[PDB]
């Protein structure tokens, strides 16, 4: 293994740069049936440990692999059960480790009754004069931590680790949308008669992903349409429409259908 | 002098119907103004007749352009004008060169005249119009031949800023109609920028064209640019790749350096009362709220007497808008506001299905259930080809609304219409029949509906081999049917599908508490709580199973543990009040299980504080009145509960048992018969009635009632099987 030599040689921002580890990942760590992916992932935790955005934003790009293999094998053949706490540690370092406080995401709604950077409400008639203006709403917060990943908040944690990708869209590479949207394309219809048409191989189990996970994965597909990945994102979002129709989640079929009526 | 102020008043307003009258007046002095005014009146008159088209051929020879050639070569020939009017005559000359198809000499003119040394402050409007169209025409002359990108920056960015200056200018004058070159200079810049991959200056030019104050003729342009910018805000950009419109773009970005800075720009919004969106979603929300207002301004509302092709674009554009709103308020989970937005969108759809349906899902995701059922009725009226619509209506009718009759009708309309949906059709029809079975009065009707739901659940179980809800709710309806090992088989099929479920493991443990496998079921609750700790109902199952094979101490430990979990998860909504009351009453059941009336009196008093007229609380109060040896008080509270819910069973059991004690055998007979009519599947009803029959002597039906109670006791769980919810 070339990456084995890499781990043998490594173990201060100049150490960031690297395309040799991705190709040697293609020729060494294409197979997930090796249990030495665990500590190097912790080494990927080291690249996540510091505040350097570079090591994060192009060494974070292989975790959906271990989500599908490690988590599809684990959360259903042997399995260790450790990197759920590594991803959970990433969750803790996302909700807490900015300065030492928990993260409370909250925007404020605009208004047509308010002067703003783009318009004026004063010279216009009595339509938009009068509604809760200049008021704030909360959309993600507050959110406590978790010690070890269990099945109550496995998809809450997965949900906000996906919300980490809801803030770092443009910095992604195309391969991230490739594997991320193929694996996220197969997680949704995995235990249904739709994967029979998709013929996506793997375990034939229905994964109980939740509604928020589907919304904040629809934002990701919606970023995947507009980087050349057209047909994969199209069939993926169609699968989300099907899963939302059988599962009767309103808002993912709401959003995804709004995508279906928003493509040329 | 003053004649130049009146004619200047006509030229600043761009009035092209009086100019031949003005040169008909203008007098004695020999000038060259008439050739420029009439020639520009004939070029602008030709634009008022035949405007220029995009992707046009090199024109010529045209007699009207030969006239303009006479005017321009005459004004340039004599030279009885100012130098800047000869400059603009060279600009219309080079414009003639662009229309006719001249390439090199046009660029020779635009390199010679010079517009950037011509000032921008205190400039008359027609000068800004001719010179601005010379910016656009100049860039076109730069582009029709093979850093030229910097020239696009120059002529097109200056064309944009000074064009906005002309539009705010003319609105400034008229308060004191769109052209081709305005569209060329405004659109061509950013369009080429996204052709180049110049994302940063694309967003920059968008925010430049948007931070300008609204011109009444740019409202189309502002709406379209708010649409496109909203698109790129939602499909290419994140919050880390975001910068405020008051701020600077980065230099090394995945999505160039400014060269110049003009002497004058348009009116840019700023001040202290402005709002600056600090992330891309807020700015998209502003762009699309503006686009929603302008979408109603541009709406025809399908008047359609004879007006269709000028309507469908007004509909499709708004569709793009509200789809973007759906993504915007969707990824942020703000669905009540989404329902208000689409509710503002509903002025369009007369038969247009997509708007009704997205509106319906919008009402559904935001907890609005009744209106959602109405809208789904209208969506059935529009498109009967979809089962998802009456399926969702059936979901909301059997949910919090509890419209079982309606749920039956919608389910029938599903059955009238692959197997993965019709399986849900018989599933919703079956859950509907089961919920109707619970809420019926007679025994026979209840058994009819039970057999109906049992049949429908068999149908949905056949139609789908990979459905944990067909197998599971089939096992649950069979569990209400008291046939235990079969329901256990289907539960083994459910956990065979998914072994990490709350209700499936819960039904496994309850059935194992029905076959009296105590530590087995308690271990199932141990695993099910080891993976689902904060689940309340599994904790109640732990309470009851610990009451079976553990005793009262560990049960009280679990009860206070659930006090820790309720105080943990909550401080609010209604049902946590009831869950707490469940904790107090289960603990009180433990203290009764020991035989300690005061502690249970405290527990049921703390529950009584929550819901004073709850029949379960009155029932526990009656049990305590049984513990303190007051049969009259217990009778009183047991009649307290039977006016709250006359269909409650246990109060009739212990009440009529008191009546069996107090000798009034008639009332015990009656009330036990009515308790048979409400629910004949509760064994202690048959114990009490059987002992009234033993108090009457009719030992045949007496031993039949005791055998009834024995068999029902053989089919009895720890917690009643209706505790696992019947929800799609």
UniProtKB/Swiss-Prot annotation, chain A:
Induction info: Down-regulated by beta-catenin.
Reported tissue expression: Widely expressed. Highest levels in heart, brain, placenta, spleen and testis.
BP term (GO), one: phosphatidylinositol phosphate biosynthetic process
Keyword Cytoplasm carried by entry: yes
Keywords assigned: Cataract, Cell membrane, Cytoplasm, Disease variant, Leukodystrophy, Membrane, Phosphoprotein
Annotated consequence of substituting residue 41 to R: In HLD5; induces misfolding and degradation, leading to destabilization of the PI4K complex
Taxonomy, superkingdom: Eukaryota
Compartmental location: Cytoplasm, Cytosol; Cell membrane
Principal location: cytoplasm
GO cellular component, one term: cytosol
Subunit description: Component of a phosphatidylinositol 4-kinase (PI4K) complex, composed of PI4KA, EFR3 (EFR3A or EFR3B), TTC7 (TTC7A or TTC7B) and HYCC (HYCC1 or HYCC2). Interacts with TTC7 (TTC7A or TTC7B), interaction is direct.
Protein family according to the UniProt entry: Belongs to the Hyccin family.
Role played: Component of a complex required to localize phosphatidylinositol 4-kinase (PI4K) to the plasma membrane. The complex acts as a regulator of phosphatidylinositol 4-phosphate (PtdIns(4)P) synthesis. HYCC1 plays a key role in oligodendrocytes formation, a cell type with expanded plasma membrane that requires generation of PtdIns(4)P. Its role in oligodendrocytes formation probably explains its importance in myelination of the central and peripheral nervous system. May also have a role in the beta-catenin/Lef signaling pathway.
Disease per record: Leukodystrophy, hypomyelinating, 5: A hypomyelinating leukodystrophy associated with congenital cataract. It is clinically characterized by congenital cataract, progressive neurologic impairment, and diffuse myelin deficiency. Affected individuals experience progressive pyramidal and cerebellar dysfunction, muscle weakness and wasting prevailingly in the lower limbs. Mental deficiency ranges from mild to moderate. HLD5 shows clinical variability, but features of hypomyelination combined with increased periventricular white matter water content are consistently observed.
Protein's name according to its UniProt entry: Hyccin
Species for this entry: Homo sapiens
Gene name in the database record: HYCC1
Swiss-Prot record, chain B:
Biological processes, Gene Ontology terms: phosphatidylinositol phosphate biosynthetic process; protein localization to plasma membrane
Keyword Transmembrane: no
GO cellular component terms listed in the entry, alphabetical order: cytosol; plasma membrane
Pfam families: ANAPC3, TPR_12, TPR_8, TTC7_N
Signal peptide: none
Cystine pairs: none
Superkingdom of source: Eukaryota
InterPro entries to which the protein is assigned, alphabetical: Endocytosis_PI4K-reg_protein (IPR051722), TPR-like_helical_dom_sf (IPR011990), TPR_rpt (IPR019734), TTC7_N (IPR045819)
TPR repeats: 87-121, 183-216, 319-352, 353-386, 432-467, 469-501, 502-535, 581-614, 615-648, 650-682, 683-716
Localization in the cell: Cytoplasm, Cytosol; Cell membrane
Keywords: Cell membrane, Cytoplasm, Membrane, Phosphoprotein, Repeat, TPR repeat
Function according to Swiss-Prot or TrEMBL: Component of a complex required to localize phosphatidylinositol 4-kinase (PI4K) to the plasma membrane. The complex acts as a regulator of phosphatidylinositol 4-phosphate (PtdIns(4)P) synthesis. In the complex, plays a central role in bridging PI4KA to EFR3B and HYCC1, via direct interactions.
Quaternary organization: Component of a phosphatidylinositol 4-kinase (PI4K) complex, composed of PI4KA, EFR3 (EFR3A or EFR3B), TTC7 (TTC7A or TTC7B) and HYCC (HYCC1 or HYCC2). Interacts with PI4KA, interaction is direct. Interacts with EFR3 (EFR3A or EFR3B), interaction is direct. Interacts with HYCC (HYCC1 or HYCC2), interaction is direct. Association with the PI4K complex is strongly reduced by TMEM150A.
Protein name as it appears in the record: Tetratricopeptide repeat protein 7B
Native species: Homo sapiens (Human)
């Amino acid at each position: 293994g070339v990456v084995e030599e890499w781990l043998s040689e490594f173990k201060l921002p100049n150490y960031a740069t690297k395309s040799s580890l991705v190709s040697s990942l293609y020729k060494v760590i294409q197979e997930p049936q090796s249990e030495l992916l665990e500590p190097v992932c912790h080494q990927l935790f080291e690249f996540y440990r510091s505040g350097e955005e570079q090591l994060l934003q192009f060494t974070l790009q292989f975790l959906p692999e271990l989500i599908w293999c490690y988590l599809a094998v684990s959360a259903s053949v042997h399995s260790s059960g450790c990197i759920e706490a590594l991803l959970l540690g990433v969750y803790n370092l996302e909700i807490v480790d900015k300065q030492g406080h928990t993260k409370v995401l909250s925007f404020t709604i605009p208004s047509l009754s308010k002067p703003s950077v783009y318009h004026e409400p004063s010279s216009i008639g009595s339509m938009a004069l009068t509604q809760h203006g200049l008021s704030k709403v909360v959309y993600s917060g507050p959110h406590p931590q978790r010690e070890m990943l269990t099945a109550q908040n496995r998809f809450e944690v997965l949900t906000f680790l996906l919300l980490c990708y809801n803030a770092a869209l443009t910095y992604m590479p195309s391969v991230s949308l490739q594997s991320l949207c193929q694996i996220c394309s197969r997680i949704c219809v995995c235990g249904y008669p739709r994967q029979h048409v998709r013929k996506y191989k793997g375990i034939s189990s229905r994964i109980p992903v939740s509604s928020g996970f589907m919304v904040q994965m629809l934002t990701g597909i919606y970023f995947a349409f507009y980087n050349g990945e057209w047909d994969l994102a199209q069939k993926a979002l169609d699968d989300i429409i099907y899963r939302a129709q059988l599962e009767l989640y309103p808002e993912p079929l709401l959003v995804a259908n709004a995508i279906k009526a928003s493509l040329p | 002098s003053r004649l130049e102020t009146e004619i200047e008043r006509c030229r600043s307003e761009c009035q092209w119907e009086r100019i031949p009258e003005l040169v008909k007046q203008l007098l004695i002095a020999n000038d060259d103004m008439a050739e420029l005014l009439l020639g520009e009146s004939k070029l602008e008159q030709y634009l008022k007749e035949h405007p220029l088209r995009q992707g046009a051929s090199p024109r010529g020879p045209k007699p009207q352009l030969t006239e303009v050639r006479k005017h321009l070569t005459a004004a340039l020939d004599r030279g009885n004008l100012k130098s800047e009017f000869l400059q603009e005559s060279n600009l219309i000359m080079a414009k003639l060169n662009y229309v006719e198809g001249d390439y090199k000499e046009a660029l020779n003119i635009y390199a010679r005249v010079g517009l950037d040394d011509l000032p921008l402050t205190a400039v008359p409007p027609y000068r800004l119009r001719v010179i601005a169209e010379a910016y656009a025409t100049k860039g076109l002359c730069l582009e029709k031949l093979p850093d030229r990108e910097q020239d696009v920056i120059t002529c097109y960015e200056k064309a944009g800023d000074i064009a906005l200056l002309y539009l705010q200018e003319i609105e400034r004058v008229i308060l004191s109609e769109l052209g081709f070159f305005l569209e060329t200079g405004l659109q061509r810049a950013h369009v080429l920028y996204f052709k180049n991959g110049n994302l940063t200056r694309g967003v920059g030019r968008f925010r430049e064209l948007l931070r300008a104050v609204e011109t009444r003729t740019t409202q189309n342009l502002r709406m379209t640019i708010a649409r496109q910018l909203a698109e790129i805000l939602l499909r290419g950009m994140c919050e880390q790749s975001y910068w405020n419109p008051l701020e600077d773009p980065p230099c090394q970005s995945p999505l160039n350096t400014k060269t110049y800075t003009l002497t004058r720009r348009a009116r840019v919004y700023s001040g202290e009362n402005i709002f600056c969106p600090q992330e891309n979603t807020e700015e998209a929300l502003l762009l699309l709220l503006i686009s929603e207002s302008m979408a109603n301004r541009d709406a025809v509302l399908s008047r359609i007497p004879e007006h269709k092709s000028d309507r469908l674009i007004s509909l499709q554009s708004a569709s793009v808008v509200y789809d973007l709103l759906t993504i915007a308020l969707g990824r942020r989970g703000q669905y009540e506001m989404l329902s208000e937005c689409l509710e503002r969108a509903m002025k369009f759809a007369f038969e247009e299905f997509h708007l009704w349906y997205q509106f319906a899902l919008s009402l559904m995701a935001a907890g609005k259930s009744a209106r959602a059922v109405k809208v789904l009725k209208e969506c059935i009226r529009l498109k009967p080809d979809d089962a998802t619509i009456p399926l969702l209506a059936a979901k909301l009718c059997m949910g919090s609304l509890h419209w079982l009759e309606e749920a039956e009708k919608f389910a029938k309309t599903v059955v009238d219409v692959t197997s993965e949906f019709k399986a849900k059709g018989y599933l919703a029809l079956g859950l509907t029949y089961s919920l109707q079975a619970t809420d019926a009065s007679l025994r026979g009707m209840q058994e009819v509906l039970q057999r109906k739901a049992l049949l429908a659940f068999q149908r949905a179980h056949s139609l789908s081999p990979t459905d944990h809800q067909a197998a599971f709710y089939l096992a649950l309806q069979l569990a209400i049917s008291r046939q235990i090992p079969e329901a256990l088989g289907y539960v083994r099929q459910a956990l065979q599908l998914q072994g990490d479920d709350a209700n499936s493991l819960h039904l496994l443990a309850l059935l194992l508490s029905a076959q009296k496998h105590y530590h087995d079921a308690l271990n199932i609750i141990d695993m099910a709580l080891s993976e689902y700790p904060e689940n309340f109902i599994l904790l109640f199952s732990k309470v009851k199973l610990q009451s079976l094979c553990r005793g009262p101490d560990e049960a009280l430990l679990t009860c206070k543990h659930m006090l820790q979990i309720w105080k943990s998860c909550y401080n609010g909504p209604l049902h946590p009040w009831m869950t707490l009351a469940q904790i107090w009453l289960h603990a009180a059941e433990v203290y009764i299980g020991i035989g300690k009336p005061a502690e249970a009196t405290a527990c049921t008093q703390e529950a009584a504080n929550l819901f004073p007229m709850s029949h379960n609380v009155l029932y526990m109060r009656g049990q305590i009145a049984e513990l303190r040896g007051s049969m009259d008080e217990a009778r009183r509270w047991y009649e307290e509960a039977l006016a709250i819910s006359p269909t409650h069973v246990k109060s009739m059991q212990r009440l009529a048992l008191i009546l069996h004690q107090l000798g009034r055998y008639s009332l015990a007979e009656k009330i036990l018969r009515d308790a048979v009519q409400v629910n004949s599947t509760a064994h202690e009803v048959w114990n009490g009635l059987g002992e009234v029959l033993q108090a009457q002597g009719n030992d045949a039906a007496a031993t039949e009632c005791f055998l009834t109670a024995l068999e029902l006791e053989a089919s009895s769980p720890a917690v009643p099987f209706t505790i696992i919810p019947r929800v799609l």
